[PDB]
Assembly symmetry: C3
Homo-oligomer: 180 residues x 3
């Protein structure tokens, strides 16, 4: 049986930190918890779709992931991705410490309610425009699992399967989650 796959890459830049990172120094050599620092990455998502047959020579058209490109562009690019359980949440989002005025979207992330910060200065608005709040520690593996969940929920009308999602955190390191 032949299996047919297609894969597309989507790029974006973001900041995050991995607040729970723990290391075994026998393996890391240096015990410093550097992923607990505020930092950032150039991310690449690679979506793999699969069929057991071709329709008009295709698994499905590459342009059929255009809505997802739009999601990556409009929601994640040039943003800071923060775990709602991050202990620095009330420190970095002090106008939203009690976690009450967050607006959860269907895709599973939150933006702050900007109504609550009306009449704050421009730099303060820029700050809060930055945050994409998620309910998971934003590791490459976590992000990849979340994007796999989103794709799965939405791709079914195309008649193909999402077989895996890769998330490259740097050009030399990446995560992959397979949908078996």
């Amino acid at each position: 049986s032949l299996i047919y796959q297609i894969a597309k890459e989507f790029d974006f830049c973001y900041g995050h930190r991995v607040w729970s990172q723990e290391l075994n120094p026998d393996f890391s050599l240096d015990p410093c918890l550097s992923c607990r620092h505020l930092h950032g990455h150039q991310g690449k998502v690679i979506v793999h779709l699969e069929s057991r047959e071709l329709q008009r020579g295709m698994v499905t058209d590459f342009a059929h992931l255009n809505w997802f490109k739009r999601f990556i562009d409009e929601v994640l690019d040039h943003r800071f991705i923060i775990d709602i359980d991050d202990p620095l949440f009330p420190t970095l989002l002090p106008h939203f410490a009690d976690k009450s005025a967050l607006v959860w979207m269907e895709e599973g992330y939150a933006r702050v309610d900007f109504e609550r910060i009306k009449g704050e200065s421009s730099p303060i608005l820029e700050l809060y425009e930055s945050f994409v709040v998620v309910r998971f520690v934003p590791t490459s593996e976590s992000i990849a699992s979340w994007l796999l969940e989103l794709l799965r929920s939405r791709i079914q009308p195309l008649g193909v399967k999402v077989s895996s999602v890769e998330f490259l955190e740097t050009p030399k390191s990446r995560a992959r989650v397979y949908n078996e």
Copy 2:
């Protein structure tokens, strides 16, 4: 148990069009059928070969794909790949509108019979030297499947399996066909 694989890349440039392209505008956002345009690509073929044991430390020598290199270089590079059943076939190859005087090669493509255009102008000859005629819409997935068939039928005397072939249409998007 271990499985051993080798993979090798082969590059070429070509023109084509995907004449049958259709889009679901809910997923693509734009309904424009841009792949129906005459265009081109830098293509990359990746061949994956597999064995369950190493012979002399190898799956098989990388150079044992040289004949396949020659094929890509001599047949596909700097050519325009066209489906025999593209509706524009008669328009782009008017001297061969009946599709009879084509010379089909063992690998499953054709060139025009140049006897029938003998004495045509130099530019007309250069036009007909361009075409590689195939029996499929030349999508990334169809190209990958075709080259997989070609490799499966030839590599037997090497004692190795072809496990899959990848075809990169752009650095951002690619197809893979798995033999199994």
Copy 3:
């Protein structure tokens, strides 16, 4: 079911030769056994690790291969890799022509015992500091197999599996060994 993987790349430069290379000319086209020449490469090791669950959002931390990066950097980079059974071993290492006075390490390579050439000229010392002696023909498949072995033997206390190792001989060609 979901399966989680991470992969990380490690780069190094080295010299070797494949003393035992043979070719079938129906496939290589050219019979010349060029891999038997002394030469070298830019190598890339890609380590894939797998787990059936995430812990703190991770398969395991990318930094848990820092010991492996050190091994690559300190043992393999800017070295010449030679099989102890290369017919040229006595010619290239004439002060260790009997192939004893080698110091084998747990990772499965040897360096010469420098006590034996104490007192020799500086250029002679430089020559011998170059060699990494191994018990296989140093093909890409063999290097990958060996690195896989080292990784499996070390990674067990982290509770993840080494699923495969890729070893890139050139940008265009690579080996992969899967741990099935």
